[PDB]
Inverse folding.
């Protein structure tokens, strides 16, 4: 019943910006943190940061602070992640993952992921 | 910090296998709140354990977490064929999270 639906594949030009979405459903949105994670081939997983849908407080990996902007929209139960000044290093699969943070910290449900390809117009 | 996991491990059905998660900074502690997540083909991720030893809801009990010596460990007691996957551990370092490189588990 808990579901995290992320937006479709994206193709964007270098230097541009993009906004990815993560639609949450089947639970109380504001009760869980939402993380964003970056996956590139041979590069395992990279943590981008998390957002608390309750107050929209964020925590970032230093390496992504100037790269990513996390927000939420309570009404639509959607978490967004904007990525700016795109380069080919940003090409990857991006996931949103929910976390329970009371008494412990654990991920449970993950989105299916969104593929981003940063591609120059020929 | 660099988080290290076994590159790949092989087990047979019904056996017990232990995956480890090492921290380059020193011993892993409960304050690293070790997480373990499972990736299955088709980019299908599932959180298993968080805070060293707490299982997310619906996760089979055969998956358990602990600290063994200097490392965080994920033990799978009675490996199942469906357990064949890539397991990532992640350690919390007082403000950010680091993922290990993942362990590919093969079940014979
Ligand atoms: O302990 C964690 C933790 C442990 C394991 C995986 C992930 C996290 C995590 O994401 C996190 C944590 C603590 C803080 S706290 O100092 O603010 O309370 C955060 O802000 C935060 O985002
Ligand atoms: C839904 As996806 C496979 O772009 O990995
Ligand atoms: Cl945008
Ligand atoms: Cl990371
Ligand atoms: Cl891997
Ligand atoms: Na991998
Ligand atoms: Na590895």
């Amino acid at each position: 019943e808990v579901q995290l639906q992320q937006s479709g594949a994206e193709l964007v030009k270098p230097g541009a910006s993009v906004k990815l979405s993560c639609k949450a459903s089947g639970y109380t949105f504001t009760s869980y943190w939402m993380h964003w994670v970056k996956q590139r081939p041979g590069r395992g997983l990279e943590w981008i940061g998390r957002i608390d849908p309750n107050g929209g407080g964020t925590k970032y990996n230093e390496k992504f602070k100037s790269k990513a902007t996390l927000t939420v929209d309570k009404p639509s139960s959607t978490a967004y992640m904007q990525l700016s000044s795109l380069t080919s290093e940003d090409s990857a699969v991006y996931y949103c993952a929910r976390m329970w943070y009371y008494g412990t910290y654990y991920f449970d449900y993950w989105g299916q992921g969104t593929t981003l390809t940063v591609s120059s117009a020929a | 910090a660099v988080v290290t996991q076994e590159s790949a491990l092989t087990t047979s059905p019904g056996e017990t296998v232990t995956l480890t998660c090492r921290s380059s900074t020193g011993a892993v502690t409960t304050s690293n709140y070790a997480n373990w997540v499972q990736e299955k083909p088709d980019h299908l991720f599932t959180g298993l354990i968080g805070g060293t030893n707490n299982r997310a809801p619906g996760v089979p009990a055969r998956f358990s977490g602990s600290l063994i010596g200097n490392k965080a460990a994920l033990t799978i007691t009675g490996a199942q064929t469906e357990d064949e996957a890539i397991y990532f551990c992640a350690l919390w370092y007082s403000n950010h999270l680091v993922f290990g490189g993942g362990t590919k588990l093969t079940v014979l």
The longest strand of chain B covers residues 85-93. The interface with chain A takes residues 33, 35, 37, 43-47, 49-51, 54-58, 88, 90, 92, 95-102 of chain B (CB under 8 Å). Residues 27 and 70 of chain B are 4 Å apart (CA to CA).
